[PDB]
RNA sequence: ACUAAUCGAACCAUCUAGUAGCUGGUUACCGCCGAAGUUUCCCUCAGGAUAGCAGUGUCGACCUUCAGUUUUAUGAGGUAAAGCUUUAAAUAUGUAAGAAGCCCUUGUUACUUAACUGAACGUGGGCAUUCGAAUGUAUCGACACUAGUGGGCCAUUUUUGGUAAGCAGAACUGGCGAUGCGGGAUGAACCGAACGCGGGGUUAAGGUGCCGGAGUGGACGCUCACAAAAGGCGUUAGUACAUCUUAUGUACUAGCCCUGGGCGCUCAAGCGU
């Protein structure tokens, strides 16, 4: 859902006399802003245990940045997914330069093969596939074979739309 | 409109669309905006923001009309009474929540804003969290602000 | 039970007698009284139609009607505001005696230590 | 007769606000931050941020 | 329609512009304010009165007060969890939130009680420059005459009874009967928005291939056109089991398709983000 950043949420239970420092639960969540961020992280907070937002307070929200973004690398995402039969756990391989560009993929993915939206989908875990044959994924594995080389056939050039007549016919080979 | 958000959005004097208002966060004035959250957005306003409404779209009620902040005088004369004398002082009574707030704040009328400068969202009628423009949203209101203001 | 003519009674309206039972339009609501007889207690209720109140005058036995302790939180506040203000003119000193609608929490800082903060993650269906 | 913005007119923002000859004229929008060297982001702070 | 057969019997002027119901009609302009089907009480059917909502005037205090709102305190309801009905709560919903107020002291009474035990009429105090929450302020209160509806319709929500399924009835809210504008290719539905006459700017709901103002715009996938654990040797996406120097092959899950406005479109001008 849009450019979404990495956000690290921390929170925990309004302190009472009875029980002073509570625990601190941190969670993960993907967000396009800080709102939404803090939005999903009490929606799941409630789901697990009974702390609400009336009764929670935030202490911490941060931005979670990639630290190699200009390498391409592997991401194995698991998910959680709520259609009209129920819910389903699956299990997609992604090849993106950082988390959020393969958690963009996955949305776009998932909602186009299975119609699924932000509020359905839960994510499970992402991880960085460190080698190799643990990708478990055919198209990708065409991807990390050995020496790929591929021609580019029937390239549409780029015509100006607002060139609207031509006087050559366009060739397709470049 | 049911009456119960009917009469919050005119004790609030949102009574049109495009309606702007500065209200103390408060667990009085808290839950009277969550019940209106289908009919309003709101957010935290910077400095800036309290600065160019104030010297921009800034009116005054003075004994029933609508008075452009226009001189100095016009505040001595209905805030005076409070130790506001200028509008930097209503600038920062606003901004930096003081022990009159609330003469200060009805003390202007309610800024007509125009429509924003760039549209709203394709479907402005959903919460903030979900994409639309209704609701809480936090220091993006400032740059709502920008385009209306 | 006793009651006076003029203090505020609640309406219960129990299961147990069913001679003379108010409507469920006046379950559970709190009135004035006008009325005391043997069993049934004059009771004076406001009634919402359209834009206004209109009031309505019934009779409820003493089955039902329990003292309301609605204003005891006023009886207890003008108390407090009594001995508090002997207090503050013998000391010399003001105090705040009305009520503050609870404003937002101010800022602190909570520290990390002894307190490692735990990731959590959703669950799956099984 | 004519309300004048005094975020245009820089005349009528002189008659409401005397300061602000002054705030321009020193730079007071362009405040440089206090020197000193930074202290490096402690080591627990970077395992918090990439934890699992 | 015609013929045969069937039933009946005047006209004139006046009373008389008879009366009853029930139709049709009812004559310049502009401005301001603007509704209703609803409460209580009677009696012939042939329906009355009243309360409301409304218009003109008119009179008394001064936004003190008030309020289809929140908050605080306290009732009332069901549904999970939960304990051995109490527990904690959703959701709407009563009451109170000072000076028109409090507490206790002391007398009387026609009332009541063992008794100021209470109730009523009289004594005492304190805070009038935080008078004891927030927000609002175009504050009200009270008379007359004078209307029009007084018996409806639709939708939601709740609730009740019931059918083979239907359906039927209340109450609440919004609306209609009394509404123009943009959209819905069209509309009595719905979405936006409610209205003096103009100029400019920005939008909403909806749209940007042409008719038609606006993108043949950008990213990634899929497709070629009733109804069931249904048939697919069509394609893609995911899961679970078995072989392997001793790449596979079986069954499911999810897409979506074959069977079960015009022009036109198919690396869309379709679908999802």
């Given at each position: 859902?849009?450019?979404?950043?990495?956000?690290?949420?921390?929170?925990?239970?309004?302190?009472?006399?009875?029980?002073?420092?509570?625990?601190?639960?941190?969670?993960?969540?993907?967000?396009?802003?800080?709102?939404?961020?803090?939005?999903?992280?009490?929606?799941?907070?409630?789901?697990?245990?009974?702390?609400k937002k009336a009764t929670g307070e935030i202490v911490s929200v941060n931005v979670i940045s990639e630290k190699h973004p200009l390498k391409v690398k592997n991401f194995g995402i698991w998910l959680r997914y709520d259609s009209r039969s129920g819910t389903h756990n699956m299990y997609k391989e992604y090849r993106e330069t950082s988390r959020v560009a393969a958690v963009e993929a996955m949305y776009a993915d998932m909602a186009a093969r299975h119609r699924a939206r932000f509020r359905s989908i839960h994510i499970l875990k992402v991880v960085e596939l460190?080698?190799?044959?643990?990708?478990?994924?055919?198209?990708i594995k065409q991807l990390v074979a050995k020496n790929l080389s591929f021609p580019l056939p029937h390239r549409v050039p780029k015509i100006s739309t607002k060139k609207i007549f031509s006087a050559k016919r366009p060739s397709t080979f470049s | 409109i049911p009456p119960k958000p009917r009469k919050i959005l005119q004790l609030l004097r949102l009574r049109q669309i495009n309606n702007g208002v500065f209200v103390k966060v408060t667990?009085?004035?808290?839950?009277?905006?969550?019940?209106?959250?289908?009919?309003?957005?709101?957010?935290?306003?910077?400095?800036?923001?309290?600065?160019?409404?104030?010297?921009?779209?800034?009116?005054?009620?003075?004994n029933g009309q609508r008075i452009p902040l226009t001189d100095n005088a016009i505040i001595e004369e209905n805030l005076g009474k409070y130790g506001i004398?200028?509008?930097?002082?209503?600038?920062?009574?606003?901004?930096?929540?003081?022990?009159?707030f609330k003469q200060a704040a009805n003390f202007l009328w309610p800024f007509k804003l125009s429509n924003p400068n760039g549209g709203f969202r394709p479907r402005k009628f959903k919460h903030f969290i979900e994409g639309g423009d209704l609701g809480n949203r936090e220091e993006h209101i400032n740059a709502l602000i920008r385009a209306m203001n | 039970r006793t009651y006076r003519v003029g203090d505020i009674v609640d309406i219960k309206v129990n299961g147990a007698v069913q001679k003379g039972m108010p409507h469920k339009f006046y379950h559970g609501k709190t009135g004035v009284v006008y009325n005391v007889t043997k069993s049934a207690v004059g009771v004076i209720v406001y009634k919402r139609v359209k834009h206004r109140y209109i009031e309505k005058r019934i009779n409820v036995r003493i089955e039902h009607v329990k003292p309301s302790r609605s204003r005891e939180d006023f009886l207890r506040r003008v108390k407090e505001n009594a001995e508090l203000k002997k207090k503050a003119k013998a000391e010399g000193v003001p105090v705040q005696l009305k009520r503050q609608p609870a404003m937002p929490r101010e800022a602190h800082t909570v520290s990390i230590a002894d307190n490692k903060p735990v990731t959590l993650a959703p669950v799956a269906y099984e | 007769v004519q309300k004048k913005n005094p975020l245009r007119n820089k005349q009528i923002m002189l008659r409401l606000n005397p300061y602000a000859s002054t705030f321009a004229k020193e730079k007071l929008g362009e405040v440089k931050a206090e020197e000193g060297k930074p202290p490096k982001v402690p080591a627990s702070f970077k395992e918090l941020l990439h934890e699992a």
């Open positions: 859902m849009g450019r979404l950043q990495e956000y690290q949420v921390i929170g925990r239970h309004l302190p009472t006399e009875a029980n002073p420092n509570p625990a601190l639960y941190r969670m993960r969540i993907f967000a396009p802003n800080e709102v939404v961020a803090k939005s999903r992280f009490w929606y799941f907070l409630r789901g697990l245990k009974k702390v460190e080698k190799t044959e643990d990708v478990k994924r055919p198209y | 667990k009085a004035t808290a839950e009277m905006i969550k019940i209106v959250e289908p009919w309003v957005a709101y957010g935290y306003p910077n400095l800036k923001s309290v600065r160019e409404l104030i010297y921009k779209r800034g009116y005054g009620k003075v004398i200028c509008i930097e002082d209503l600038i920062h009574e606003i901004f930096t929540v003081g022990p009159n | - | -």
